[PDB]
Amino acid sequence: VDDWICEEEITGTDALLRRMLLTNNAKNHSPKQLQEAFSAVPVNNTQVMQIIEHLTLLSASELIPYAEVLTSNMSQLLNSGVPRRILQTVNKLWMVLNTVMPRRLWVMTVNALQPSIKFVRQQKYTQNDLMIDPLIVLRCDQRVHRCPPLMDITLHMLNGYLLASKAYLSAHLKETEQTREELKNALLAAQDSAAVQILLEICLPTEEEKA
Amino acid sequence: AAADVSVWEENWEDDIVQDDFNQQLRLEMER
Amino acid sequence: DANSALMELDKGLRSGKLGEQCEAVVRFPRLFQKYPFPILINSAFLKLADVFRVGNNFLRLCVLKVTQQSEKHLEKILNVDEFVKRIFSVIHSNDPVARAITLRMLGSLASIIPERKNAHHSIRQSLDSHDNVEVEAAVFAAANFSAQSKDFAVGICNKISEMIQGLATPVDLKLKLIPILQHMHHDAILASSARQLLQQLVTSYPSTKMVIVSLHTFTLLAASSLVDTPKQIQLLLQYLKNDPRKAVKRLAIQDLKLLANKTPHTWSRENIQALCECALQTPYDSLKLGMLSVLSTLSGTIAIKHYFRSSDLVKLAQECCYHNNRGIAAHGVRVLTNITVSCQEKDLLALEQDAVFGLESLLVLCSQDDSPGAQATLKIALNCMVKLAKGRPHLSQSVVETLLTQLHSAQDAARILMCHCLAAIAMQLPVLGDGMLGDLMELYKVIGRSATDKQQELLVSLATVIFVASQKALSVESKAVIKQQLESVSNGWTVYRIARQASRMGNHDMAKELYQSLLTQVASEHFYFWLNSLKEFSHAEQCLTGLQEENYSSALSCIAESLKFYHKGIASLTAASTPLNPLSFQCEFVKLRIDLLQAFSQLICTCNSLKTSPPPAIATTDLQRCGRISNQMKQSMEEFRSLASRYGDLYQASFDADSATLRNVELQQQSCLLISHAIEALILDPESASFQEYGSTGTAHADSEYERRMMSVYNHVLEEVESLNRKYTPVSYMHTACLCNAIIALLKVPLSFQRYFFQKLQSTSIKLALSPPIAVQNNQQLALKVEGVVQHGSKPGLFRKIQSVCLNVSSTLQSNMTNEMEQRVEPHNDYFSTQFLLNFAILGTHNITVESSVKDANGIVWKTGPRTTIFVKSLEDPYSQQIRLQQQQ
DSSP states (O other): OHHHHTTSOSSSHHHHHHHHHGGGOOTTOOHHHHHHHHTOSSOOHHHHHHHHHHHTTSOTGGGGGGHHHHHHGGGGGGSTTOOHHHHHHHHHHHHHHHTTOHHHHHHHHHHHSOOOSSTTSOOOOOHHHHHHOGGGGGSSOGGGGGOHHHHHHHHHHHHHHHHHHHHHHHHHHHHHHOOHHHHHHHHHHHHHHHHHHHHHHHTSOOHHHHO | OOOOOOSOTTOTTOOSSOOHHHHHHHHHHOO | OHHHHHHHHHHHHTSOOHHHHHHHHHHHHHHHHHOOSHHHHHHHHHHHHHHHHHSOHHHHHHHHHHHHHTTTGGGGOOOHHHHHHHHHGGGGOSOHHHHHHHHHHHHHTTTTOTTOHHHHHHHHHHHTOSOHHHHHHHHHHHHHHHHHOHHHHHHHHHHHHHHHHOTTSOHHHHHHHGGGGGGOOSSHHHHHHHHHHHHHHHHHOOOHHHHHHHHHHHHHHHHHHOSSHHHHHHHHHHHHHHOOOHHHHHHHHHHHHHHHHHOGGGOOHHHHHHHHHHHHSOOOHHHHHHHHHHHHHHHTSTHHHHHOOOOHHHHHHHHHTTOSSHHHHHHHHHHHHHHHHHOOOGGGOHHHHHHHHHHHHHHHHHHTTOOHHHHHHHHHHHHHHHHHHHHOGGGHHHHHHHHHHHHTTSOHHHHHHHHHHHHHHHHHOGGGGGGGHHHHHHHHHHHHTTOOSTHHHHHHHHHHHHHHHOSSOOSHHHHHHHHHHHHHOOOHHHHHHHHHHHHHTTOHHHHHHHHHHHTTTOOSHHHHHHHHHHHHHHHHHHHTTOOOSSOHHHHHHHHHHHHHHHHHHHHHHHHHOBTTBOOHHHHHHHHHHHTTTHHHHHHHHHHHHTTSOOOHHHHOOOOGGGOHHHHHHHHHHHHHHHHHHHHHHHHHTOTTSOHHHHHHHHHHHHHHHHHHHHHIIIIIOGGGOOSOOOOSSSSOOOSSHHHHHHHHHHHHHHHHHHTTSSSSOTTOHHHHHHHHHHHHHHHHSOOOOOHHHHOOOOOOEEOOEEOOOEEEESSSOEEEEEEEEEEOOSSTTSSOOEEEEEEEEEEEEOOOOOOOEEEEEOOSSSEEEEEEEEOOOSOEEEEEEEEEEEEESSSOEEOOSOOOEEEEEEEOOHHHHHHHHHHHO
């Protein structure tokens, strides 16, 4: 419901701002331009903002082509010194894309938030892999645990994939039928408790934070 | 940001309202 | 049945599987559309609210979507307390998502529960929640409840102010919170405090988003309160002039357009001067176009009269009507046209030709493009030309000449639009029709040779201006049109629409030929009968075109032929009537045309009845001395009066008809009344002829050539009657001559078949479900409740809107009008209900009838709704029967 209720009206400010800011028909802000902004070695967060702030006016349907750009290039946002405005706007656009195409977005986001140490093994998870093992989302880069926007992204994905894994497990049992239900219930309980325990461990301070 | 106005206000050609009788007559006799 | 379907859903909501429950819940609104009565709506909303109470959050969201969809039907719930309380119980849940859904539902239900204190406290408590979804839902609900209830608004304004100005609030929530202040219009002091707060916000939060939301909210608050509106306009003009941000200027333009649409009278001369100066000295064309849109909105209102020499407005309008930008040119020429037609002041007649030439140049600019923006500007220009032709008729010739010259060098869509413009101008001013026939006929010849796809619309438009522009009939032009149709046009629809136009303008021979051609092209037999009936009506109207001025024998023969063809046509039309296409207006209209023609024939016969001499016994002693002719004239007078009454009945049974059809029916009724009055004042009561025929209208502004001909005939007949009032005894041949000449004059103008005869657009009805072979005791008088919903098809109020519904109840025994009673009830959300009390003191069988009538906004009563009847079996109770039997025995 959190993915649906966010589409509900509040006071119509979004419609008014869209009508009065997006009608300048300066549509130069293509996904390619945002990609070039993200790929600049002396990266300019200000220029990055001048694009993505304009994208907050966009509808979810017209925000589709930018998803691979602001998902693939958002491993860079974990680096130090990145403004919280950029991360907040990326979170907002992520929610607006989660309204319209959550499944592909979640897959791209999990594949984008990999730790990327031995990234030649770019482990490209599919929907099936994540539905089997929802704890993959918690095997992200360690910096996501202290990035509240990207942590919020990760928590949305974790909740969604736990529910998806419930559905997938029931479907798989039904398919392989031609007890097992108790095994499924125990597996789902263990999965949810493991997710809770991992999140609680994330809530703990690190030894560095202890120092 | 626009508005619509009709040149002739008793023009019978406007398709603002389509009624069933004229619909089947048109679909039946147009070639 | 309603309850069967409601149970069919109810088993869905009781299944326990989320998919089926959600399916049922979203299936609910279609049920409300099918059965809009409060019993089903009440039961449905109670079970929906129970499901909301016990269901999970997705089911609650589905219920919220249904409630948002059905905000009309929630006034009909009636059982508000239980429904709301079982909805309200979810606000106590620890789940903030459930609380958010409950808050959104309460905001959606705000209209039926204002001043509900627990809901108010819930909003106030959830406003300072720590869950953002709950805070957003609380803001939405606060907006709704401030819109509805004044006490919540005054109780919440301080809290909203402290959250907006509070430094701990993010900018996004501040943006979400500002539009709450637009609902602070309930009190003057509340509105002033909100105004002060909004001023503080615009000065202290000058971001683009924040200032835009704040200025829009201030504009809406000023519109609602309409006391700060002048200084709100001044503030908006200040921001438009001073603030350099294009977005802020664009918002200021939109807000000033809103205020111009809402309160044009409040605009001062200084405000319009400031706006004109801003339009003059701005470099950007989009902003200039916006300000000219505002000024063109203003010029069409009374603000132009308040604005008044060569001022900044006229200078701007003249500069803008020659702009490169087509939209700016259209707005400028619209301003010029509005000034020219609204202000007859002779100090600004120099721009009369500036307006004409600007319109012509805009035609030349827009004709070749064939693009939607160019088509819009072309429509604006042609509407302006139509308005200018009406307002300043001496410019009509130049406008028509420009249109005709531009017709030969324009694209097909542009040609269609200018054909519509020419049709409008020639309908209002038919003298210009003769001057446009040559060009239109030439273009009709050249179009028809290569008419492939888009030229079909062009063909019907050209034929429409040909028929409209032709004051008289057609001899060679008719041959050209028939040849152009038969040569290439296998498109039956084009031929049918052109025949419709021909019968509209009274060219009935052409219509007869085209309808005859259209037979064998249709597949359905009822459409075949409809087209055959149209052909026969066209033939019948063509039959009485050959009427000589004084030949009454030829007139009688022609009316007989017309009546033969009319009877054939009405038999065919009856054969064409089907369910859900009853053609009731057509049948009644042509039946009333068959009458008043055989009534005309009877009056022609009574003209000649004077030649059969009176008896001598009666001749020896004033009106009885005439003999049979006196009683026959009395019968004719009564028949024509009844015909006028029936035409009025057709008029007030035509609530869904366009104005022109109603005016046509009025003309027919007035012809009936004219003949009746002539008979009375010449034969039956010349001493009581009343005052003179002093036409209050005088030179009435007719909307069609048929109107002009009808009123001219009426005026000539009334002049003839007045000059012949007491000059002769009622045995006179001159009275019969005047009456028969009136018949000739009325019939020599061809009948016009109007839009409602062909196209039905509005289609409003009444359902009228009433609570019930029903037994009622003699002592206990019936308690009858009638509920009804007004139905619509597509655009509800296309021609007129229902203001109130009159419910006349009558009772006829032995199935006679023993229980007359009326109740004018205002339907709120297209729904009305009322209770009736019906006495049944007399034992027996009673036929209860309820006939709905509609009182429109103006006040005219229309007899629209069904006269549904129910039968009541009233019998004496066993107690009274036994007591009376024992007492008598």
